[PDB]
Amino acid sequence: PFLALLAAX
Amino acid sequence: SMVACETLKTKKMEVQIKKNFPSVLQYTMTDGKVMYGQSKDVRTVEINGTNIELGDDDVTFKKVSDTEATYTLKVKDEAKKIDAVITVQITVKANQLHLNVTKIKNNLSEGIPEGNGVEENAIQTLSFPNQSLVSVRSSQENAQFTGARMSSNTQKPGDTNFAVTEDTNVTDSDYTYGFISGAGLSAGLWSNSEHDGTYVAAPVRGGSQNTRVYATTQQTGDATSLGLASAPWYYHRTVTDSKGKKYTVAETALPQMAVAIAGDENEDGAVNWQDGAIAYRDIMNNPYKSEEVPELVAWRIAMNFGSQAQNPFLTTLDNVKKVALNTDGLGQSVLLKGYGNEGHDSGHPDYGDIGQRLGGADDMNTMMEEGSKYGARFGVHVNASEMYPEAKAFSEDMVRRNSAGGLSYGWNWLDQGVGIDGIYDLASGSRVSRFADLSKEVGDNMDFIYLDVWGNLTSSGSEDSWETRKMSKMINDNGWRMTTEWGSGNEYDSTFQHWAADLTYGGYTSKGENSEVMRFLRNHQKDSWVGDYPQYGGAANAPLLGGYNMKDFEGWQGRNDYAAYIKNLYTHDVSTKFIQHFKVTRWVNNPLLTADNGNAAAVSDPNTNNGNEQITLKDSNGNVVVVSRGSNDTSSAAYRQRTITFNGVKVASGVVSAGDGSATGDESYLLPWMWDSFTGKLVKDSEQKLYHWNTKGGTTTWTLPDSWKNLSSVKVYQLTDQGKTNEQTVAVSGGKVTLTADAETPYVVYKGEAKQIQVNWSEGMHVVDAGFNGGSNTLTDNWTVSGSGKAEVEGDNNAMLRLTGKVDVSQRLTDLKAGQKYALYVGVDNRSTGDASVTVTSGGKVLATNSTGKSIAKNYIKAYGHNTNSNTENGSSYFQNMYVFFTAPENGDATVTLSHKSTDGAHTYFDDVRIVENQYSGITYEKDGTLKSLTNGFENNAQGIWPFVVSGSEGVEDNRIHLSELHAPFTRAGWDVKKMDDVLDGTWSVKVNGLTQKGTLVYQTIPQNVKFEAGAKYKVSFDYQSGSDDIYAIAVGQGEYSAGSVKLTNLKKALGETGKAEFELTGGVNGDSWFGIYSTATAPDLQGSTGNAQDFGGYKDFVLDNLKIERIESQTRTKAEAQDKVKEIRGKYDSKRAELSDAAWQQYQDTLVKARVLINKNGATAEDFTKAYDILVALDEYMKLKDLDRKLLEAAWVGHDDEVRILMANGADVNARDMYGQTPLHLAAFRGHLEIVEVLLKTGADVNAQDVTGTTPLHLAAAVGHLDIVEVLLKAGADVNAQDWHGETPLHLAAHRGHLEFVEVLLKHGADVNAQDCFGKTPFDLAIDNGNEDIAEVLQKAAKL
Ligand SMILES: [Cl-]
Ligand SMILES: [Cl-]
Ligand SMILES: [Cl-]
Ligand SMILES: [Cl-]
Ligand SMILES: [Cl-]
Ligand SMILES: [Mn+2]
Ligand SMILES: [Mn+2]
Ligand SMILES: [Mn+2]
Ligand SMILES: [Mn+2]
After folding, report:
1. Exposed, middle or buried by CB within 10 Å (0-12, 13-18, 19+), for B76?
2. Which strands form B13-18's sheet, in the order they lie side by side?
C-alpha cells in the first residue's frame, strides 16, 4: 500500500 | 640671486615657489584671488618610513623657464641605510601645477639584479610629509574640506564634507579624493600614489582601498591651516611570494602629483569642491579607453562551458546583429565568458588558448572585426588567481602554497582549482607573457579584459593597489580596456564592475561606488556605480543618474530571455548611457548626505528644485542636461519621480520600473540620440534620431529639440528583432509631436524616411541564417522550402525552424575548402514518430545523411539556448546535436537539407546549422547504411561528449561532465594527492567529476548519434578509470530513461590504472536502444582522505576513453526457431497479465507483436529470423529481472528474510520501486526488519530513497516506532533533516505520533529542532496540537540550549 499517509495517523 | 623664492607664470596664474625645497608659497590668479601652499618651513622627505629633514646644503634649485623649475635633493640617513638623490620637477600650465619626481638615484645600490632579484637598500617608498601643496585656513571665508573614501554599501556614503575651523585637527588623514575651498578658490590634489588606506565599506582588496591624498592641519599664526599632500609612492618595492622567495620589482610609474586651482567654475555663486572637481578633471588620471563607455549601451555575457560550445564565435556575431536591429545600432559590449580552452572555468590561466571548439582565433577575429561595424566591443573573462592542472602554465612555481607547504586549494567543479602565487606570477614575468600570448592571437581587435575575482585574496593575502596597478598596466599596454568583478575593486583603472552593473548580486553592502564626489568626477567614464535596485535602499532608491542594469540572454547563469534583456536596456540603460554623454557640473540637495553621517557642509540650495536633489551636466558643445528629483522624502511617491531636460526641454519624466523587478513604473521619454556608435561623434543633422519609450503605454506629447522645430512631420518606427517596422508619419505642430506607444515597446523617430540596417545573416558560417534569425522571410530569401507539409520560423525568444508533415528546407553551402573533411551538426528536437533528417547532397547525389526518430533525451545544458527549461514545446526541450560527416566536393556544389519524412501533425524543431572543419573518421557503415562500427578516442570532438549526451543527474546545470585534457605530470595520477588520471589515451577523455550517489543516469548515447537496429547485436567496449567500487555503472535502456527500465552493471574500481569494460547489446524493436553511465546509490571509498583531497583524489570520479561499438554476428536462426521462441515466451508470461502493470504488459505485447512481424513478413530471410529470435531472448532476460524485482518487494513487505538474500544474488534490483516510488527498504522500515535493512544497505540500497511524496525510510521508521532500524539507517548515512512533500522531517513525524525515545535519538544525531514544515509548524508545535506535553518540553529545552 501507499505508506505516506499510513505513517502520518 | 639672493631672493629665496622664484615665480612661475601662466596666463591664468602666478605661483611663488621656494628655492630651498619644492614647495609652493602661494598661487595668485589673474583676478587677484590667492590660495596658500606651505607657509611654514617644512622640508621633510620620507624614504622607507624614515623622515629626513633637509637643510640648505641638501637642495639645489634651477629655474628652467617661466613654467618650470628643477630641484636636486640629497636625502641621507647613515643609520637607516638611506643615501639618495631625488630630482623633482615643478611645472605650471593654465591653473595647474605639477610636481613630478623625475629621477631617483640610489648611492647605496647598483640596481635591481636580473630576474627581479632583491635590491639591497632599495628605495621602496617616498613621500613629502605635510608638504601642503594647497591649503585653506580657518580665517578664510567659507573654508571647507570635501573628501571621498570607498563605499560599496548603498546605506553608507563614502564622502565627508566639513568646515575648516580652529578646532579642525587632522594628521595624514587619507582619502581617494580630497578638495579644499576658501576665499573664493577651490582645489583638489591628484597623485598616482598606490597607497592603500581608510575606506568606508568594501568586501575585497584589489585596489578598493587606494587613498592618494593626505590632509594635515598646522598652526599658521592665529589660524588653523588644513593642507593637502600626496600619500606615499612606491618606487622599488621588495615583495615575498608564497614560498618565502623575495623579489625587488621596479616602479609602475615615477612619482607624480598635481593641483588645479578653480574659481566659481559652474557659475552658481558659491565656491566649493564642485568647482575644484570640474578643474580636477584636467589633471586626473583617466582609465584607459574610458572615452568609449557612454557608447556601451548593450552589455551582456556570451557563455561556453564544459566542451559543449553553446555559443561559438560566429553565433555570437549573429546575436550582435539581432541586438543591433532591435536597438537601431546602439553600441554593445559582449563579455566572452568561456572564450578559451573548454569554456568557463577551464584552462585558467592560459590566456592565449582560444577555444578550438568555438572556432578558435580565426572565428574570434571574424566575430570582432565584423561585430565592430555594428558598434560591438568584445572582451574575454580571464583569471589570475586560480588555475587547473590542464593549463600548460600550471607549474610548481605557479602553485600558491600555505605556511605548511601544502597546496592552497580552490574550487572543485569540472577539475580541482589551485590558487596561483600572485607575487611569483607578477615578479617572474609569467603573467605578462601569457597576456602577450593572447595579444598575438587577437592583435588590436579585442576591446577589453574582464579580470575575475581579483581582490578576494585567492592569489595572495595582499592583492593591493600596487599589484592591481601593475595588473591593469600589462592589460592596458596591449590596447585593452580594464574591467573587473567586485563593485569596489580597482578604483584607479577599471571602467566596469560586474557586481556594480549586475545589481542582483551581493546585496546592499557589496555594490558599486556609493560616492557623490567619485560619481560627480567619473560617472561618464565607468559603469561602476549604484543603479536602481530599491530593496537595497539609500543609493539604490532611484539614483538620478541611473546606473547600469545588466541582464543576459546567452547562457550566463542559465539566462536566455531575449525579450526581458531588450526590455531592460530600454528601461534603465538607454537613459543611463544618454546621461554619460555629459559631465556633472553641479549637484545639490543630495538626500543621502546629512550632518550625522559626516556631511554637514554638503552642497545645498533651497532655490533649486524646491530644495530637492538636482544634478546639472554639460558636454564640450555647451549642451545642458538637468536631472531633478520630485521630492527628497523617501516616504513620498515623488522621491522616485525624475525629470530630465535637454537644453531646457523635457525629454524624460516619471518613475522607472524598479530595477529589482518588483514594480512597473510610469516613465516615458523621447531621448535625442545625437551620437554615432563608434567614437561618439555627432551624426550629420539629417541622421539624427530620438528614442521613444512609454512604460505603461498610451499617448504623450513632447517638444522636439531645437533643430527639429521647423519640421512638418517625423517618421516613427517600432523596433523589433527584425529592425524598423510599422512606419508612421506623425505631424509636427508648433515644434511638438504626439506619440501613441504600446507599453514597453521601443520606437525610433527620424526627420525623414530611414533605411533598414543591412544584415547578412551568418557570415563565415557557410550558410545564410543558420540560427533562423531572419524572420518568416528567411524561408523565402535564404532557405528553399518544398513538400506538402509546412515549414515555419517559430519561437518568440531564440527563433527555431519548425516542421510539420512532409517538408524539406534546403540551402546551398558556401566557402568550403574542396577535399577537406567537414562535420555538419544541427540541434534537433523531434516530437514526431516519423524521422527528422539532416542530409548533405552534391549534384543530386547524397554525400551524407542522418536521422532521428522521436527524441528520447531532454537537454540539461544550462548555458545552452534550448535546454529543457526553455519550453521548445509542452514545457520541455529535447534539443540534441545531430551530425553528418562529408568531404567537400571538388565541384564546389554542396547543399544541406533539413526534413521531416512522416505526414503526421507532430512537430520537428531544428536550430543552429553548424558546418565546421573536422577530421573525425571513426564511423563505418554496412551496405544498407546501418552501423557497422563506431570508434571514438574523443580527440576530434567538434563539441560535447558525442556519441553521448549529458543526462539529468544534476538537472539543468553547468554539468560536471566535459572533455578532460592532458598536461603531464599534473593531470596524471601521483601528482600531489591525485589518484586518477584525467586522460586515458591521447590528449582527451570524457570526465565525470564527483557525481556519486545520484541514483540516476549521468550520460547516454541517443539513436541520432549511434543507432542500434532492432534485433541486431553489438559489442560495446571502452577504457575507464573509476574512483571506487560500484559508484558508477553501465546502463542499457530503450527509449526515454525511466528508473527500473534499464539494465545496470556496476563498474569496479580502476584508480590510477586503466580498466577495460565490454558487454553486448541487442537493439530494441523501436530502434531507440542506447547505453550510458549511471551514478548508483553506493558511497565512494575516500580511503581516509580529508578536505580537498576527497575531491582532488579522484575517489568520486569517472573517466572514459577509447569507445568502440561494433555490430557482431549472432548465431543464425531458422523461421522455426524464431516461432518456437515465441511460443516459449508466451508460455512463460502470457498468464502473468494480472501480476503486471497496465504499461508493462503493453511493452511486452509491443515487443512480441513486433518480433512476429519480422518472422511472418513475405520474403523474410535468416537475418529477420535471427533478429526476431534475439529480440525475444532480450525480452525474456527483461521480464525475468522485472519478476525478481516485484518478488523482492513482496519478500521485504511480508519479511521472508532468506528469499531477500537469494533474490539479489539472482539479479533483483536492491532499489526496485513500486507504483508509489517505494523501495524494499521503504517496506522493511515500515514493517520492522532489522536484518533485511542491513543486508539491503550492504548490497547498495538507497538509504535516502524518496517515494512519490518525498518520504524516506527514516521518515517511516520515526513515524511508526522502530529504534533498531533508526540506529542502522543513521549509521548508513540517512539524512536526519530529510523533508517530505509537506516539509515534514523525521523529527516532525516522531513528535506528532508520540515517540519520546525517537525525539532524543534524532536530536542527538543532529535533527534541526526549529525546522518548519509547510504549515510553518516546528516539531515542537506538532507535539502541542496532538497532546504530547512530555515531548514538547524536551524540544523546548533543546531549542534554548
Ligand atoms: Cl510610497
Ligand atoms: Cl507608478
Ligand atoms: Cl516527446
Ligand atoms: Cl565528432
Ligand atoms: Cl501544500
Ligand atoms: Mn560654484
Ligand atoms: Mn535560433
Ligand atoms: Mn582519448
Ligand atoms: Mn578539464
Report:
1. middle
2. B5-9, B13-18, B24-29, B34-36, B134-137, B223-230, B213-220, B173-175
From the CA of B322, the nearest ligand is 7
Question: What residues of chain A lie within 8 A of the CB of B1253, using their CB?
Answer: 4
Q: For residue A1, give how far its alpha carbon lies from the nearest alpha carbon of chain B (Å).
A: 9
**What are the grid coordinates assigned to B92, written together?**
605650471
Which is it for strands B44-47 and B125-127: parallel, antiparallel or unpaired? antiparallel
Ligand 8 center to residue B1104 CA distance, Å? 8
- A5: nearest CA partner in chain B: B1253
Q: How far apart are CA B1309 and CA B276, in angstroms?
A: 66
Cell readout for B156 is 553608507
Residue with cell 515517540: B1299
**Cβ contact A8–B1226 (<8 Å):** no
- Is A8 close to B1259, i.e. CB distance below 8 A? no
CA-CA distances (angstroms) from residue B1036 to B936, B1004, B1005? 19, 9, 10
Nearest to A3 among B1222, B1285, B1296 (CB): B1222
Burial B955-965 (b: 16+ CB within 10 A, else e): ebbbbbbbbbb
Chain A within 8 Å of B1251 (Cβ-Cβ)? yes
Place of cell 543609493: B539
Report the C-alpha gap between B305 and B937 in whole angstroms: 21
Residue B351 Cα, ligand 5 centroid: separation in angstroms? 51
For residue B140, the enclosing domain spans 5-281
Annotated active-site positions of B, please? Answer: 452, 485
Distance CA B684, CA B919 (A): 51
Please, what sign has the CA dihedral across residues B952, B955, B958, B959?
negative
Give residue B365's identity as a one-letter amino acid code.
N
- Which residue type occupies B1304? E
Residue B144's domain is classified under what CATH number?
A: 2.70.98.10
Q: Using CA atoms, how far apart are residues B488 and B491, in angstroms rounded to an integer?
A: 7
Asked if B42 reaches chain A (Cβ–Cβ under 8 Å), the answer is no
Closest to B544 measured CA to CA, from B615, B479, B599, B592? B615
Distance from CA of A8 to the nearest CA of B (A): 7
Number of separate helices (H) and strands (E) present in chain A: 1, 0
Distance CA B229, CA B173 (A): 10
Query: Closest Cα partner for B990 from B936, B1041, B1028, B951?
Result: B936
Which of these, B487, B495, B480, lies nearest to B446 by C-alpha position?
A: B480
Distance CA B202, CA B199 (A): 7
Phi, psi angles (nearest 5°) of residue B527: -115, 65
Measured in whole angstroms, the distance separating CA B988 from the mean position of its chain's CA atoms is 26
Q: Is the peptide bond preceding residue B606 cis, with omega within 30 degrees of 0?
A: no
Radius of gyration of chain B (CA): 37
Strand ranges in B352-495 using DSSP code E only, listed in sequence order: 376-382, 386-387, 409-412, 416-419, 448-451, 481-484
Residues with CB under 5 A from ligand 9 (ion): B 390, 414-415, 964
Backbone angles phi, psi at B1309, to 5 degrees: -80, 0
Cell of B1124: 518456437
For B1254, name the nearest residue in chain A, comparing CA atoms only: A4
Residue B101, CB-side half-sphere exposure with 13 Å CA sphere: 24
| φ/ψ of residue B41, rounded to 5 | -80, 85
**CA quadruple B893, B895, B901, B904: dihedral sign:** negative
Closest residue in A to B1326 (Cα–Cα): A8
CA of B1264 vs chain A CAs: smallest distance (Å): 6
* Inter-chain CB proximity B1255 and A3 less than 8 Å: yes
Question: Ligand 1 mean position to B928 CA, how many Å?
Answer: 74
